[PDB]
Structure 1
Amino acid sequence: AVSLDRTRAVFDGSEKSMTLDISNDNKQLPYLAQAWIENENQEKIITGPVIATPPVQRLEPGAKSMVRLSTTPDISKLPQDRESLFYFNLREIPPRSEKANVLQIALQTKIKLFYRPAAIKTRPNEVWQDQLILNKVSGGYRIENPTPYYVTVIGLGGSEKQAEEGEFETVMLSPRSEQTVKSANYNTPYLSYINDYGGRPVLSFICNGSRCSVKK
């Protein structure tokens, strides 16, 4: 019943807080909504450096509200030249029915929360994902992410259609890192990723030996 307005959140480190719109889409009953944050290892945190308010709130049927994300002083301890990963959680508490022998479902929404320090703030629609490099190796590719942002790769094939629809085990590369993915070899590999807006652009790559980089 309770839903969130986005599939990922980017916290602009140049501001003190931001808000996320939530909504009880059930127009008959009231639902409660709890929110909390988790660190990069999906472990719950309560005292900072990022807090969510309110932790719990009642939503009347069809009601709209929001959850505010704010930082504590300790936020400054995070790296300022790369993103830091957190997770935002919105779990509903359905109205208690006293029906016998029933099962009740409570939705929990968990999205990535990227803390993006001011030094690497981006302009709307900026594209850094085109800096990825694919290195052919046994079994597939070793993808390199030299950028200061997390990059979520959702597709990799021999064509655009294949990158968007081909079966691929989603993987997320931390800033300045590299990971290996099992994959068939592709003459001109195409790669798809998820951007800040929940969109899925496709990138065209060109190879030279075992090293592939984005079409200039």
Structure 2
Amino acid sequence: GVALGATRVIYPAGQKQEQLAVTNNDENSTYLIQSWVENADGVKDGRFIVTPPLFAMKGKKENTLRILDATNNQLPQDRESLFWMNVKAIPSMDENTLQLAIISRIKLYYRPAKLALPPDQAAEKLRFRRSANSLTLINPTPYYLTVTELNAGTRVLENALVPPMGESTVKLPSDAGSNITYRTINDYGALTPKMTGVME
């Protein structure tokens, strides 16, 4: 079966390419690997190119995909832009059968140079706006914030992806406590320390 070597890719402006490992751990299998990038709207806009976009992997093997900046410096320069790297692993076949291919999909963030706020200071900037049955997360930073373990009192709320200089809203039970806590998933795919939610 196939795995990717990352759960996100941070693409610094100026880099000619970034790499993504694709691994088959099954000596007895061969897969076709078909890869492509979509923008935040699910469209293949060609801002980022993947190569090679189609190849075969036989047995226990690792292949490296290259992701190339083809933006010609045309994306916003004050905030991250969200893309989705998609890697489809197509199995071979040996009657009535349903067969499945697998798409592994991960965040690809284009990150401009010279952002005034450094990335490790982003998570603390999150703020909250609370209504009767909803909670709005406010992200004043240039970075996408992947917010998880979001709690209001003892109530676990939905995960949220809060866009740079943007907001996201989740449902909130009527009984949920006033104390909000949260964590984020960082550049390395790991959980950041629990933080107390601060009101807008």
Q: Which moved more, 1:84-93 or 1:171-180?
A: 171-180
Partner of 1:81: 78
1:121: Cα distance to partner? 8.8
* Contact map agreement 1:37 1:86 (CA 8 A) in 2: yes
Q: Distance between the aligned counterparts of 1:64 and 1:7, measured in 2? A: 16
Q: Secondary structure at the match of 1:130?
A: helix
Closer, same or farther in 2 for the Cα pair 1:122/1:54, shift >3 Å?
farther
Shift of 1:95: 1.2
The CA distance in 2 between the partners of 1:117 and 1:79, in whole Å, is 8
- CA-based RMSD: 2.1
1:196-207 superposed matches below 5 A: 196-205=187-196
Residue of structure 2 in register with 1:53 after alignment: 51
Classify 1:59/1:122 alpha carbon distance in 2 versus 1 (closer, same or farther; 3 Å): farther
| Alignment TM-score, normalising by the size of structure 1 | 0.83
Q: Give 1 or 2: higher strand fraction.
A: 2
Structure 1 position 144, deviation (Å): 0.9
Distance between the aligned counterparts of 2:14 and 2:117, measured in 1?
11
Contact 2:150 2:158 in 1 (8 A): no
Deviation at 1:158, TM superposition (A): 4.6
Instruction: Measure, in 2, the Cα distance between the counterparts of 1:37 and 1:192.
Output: 28
Q: Does 1:135 align with 2:126?
A: no
1:174 maps to 2:172 = no
Question: Distance in 2 between the 1:25 and 1:121 partners?
Answer: 42
SS in 2 for 1:77: coil
Q: Give 1:180 shift.
A: 2.5
What is the TM-score when the length of structure 2 is the normalising length?
0.89
Cα distance in structure 1, aligned partners of 2:8 and 2:157? 20
Identity of counterpart residues, as a percentage?
32
Secondary structure of the equivalent of 2:194?
strand
- What is the CA deviation profile of residues 96-115 of structure 1, one whole-angstrom value per residue up to 9, with x for unaligned ones? 32xx2122221110111111
Match in the other structure for 1:10: 10
Q: Secondary structure at the match of 1:75?
A: coil
The equivalences for 1:21-170 within 5 A come to: 21-45=21-45, 48-72=46-70, 74-97=71-94, 100-120=95-115, 126-158=120-152, 167-170=156-159
Alpha-carbon distance in 2 for matches of 1:134, 1:21: 37
Separation in structure 1 between the aligned mates of residue 169 and residue 68 of structure 2, nearest angstrom = 35
Inter-CA distance 121–17: structure 2 relative to 1 (3 Å threshold): farther
Structure 1 residue 122: Cα displacement = 8.2
Specify the SS of the correspondent of 1:120.
coil
Q: Report the Cα distance in structure 1 between the residues aligned to 2:128 and 2:149, rounded to whole angstroms.
A: 13
What does the per-residue CA deviation read over 1:25-61, in whole Å, with 9 as the maximum and x for residues that have no partner? 111121111110101111223xx22100001111110
The structure in which a higher percent of residues are helix is 1
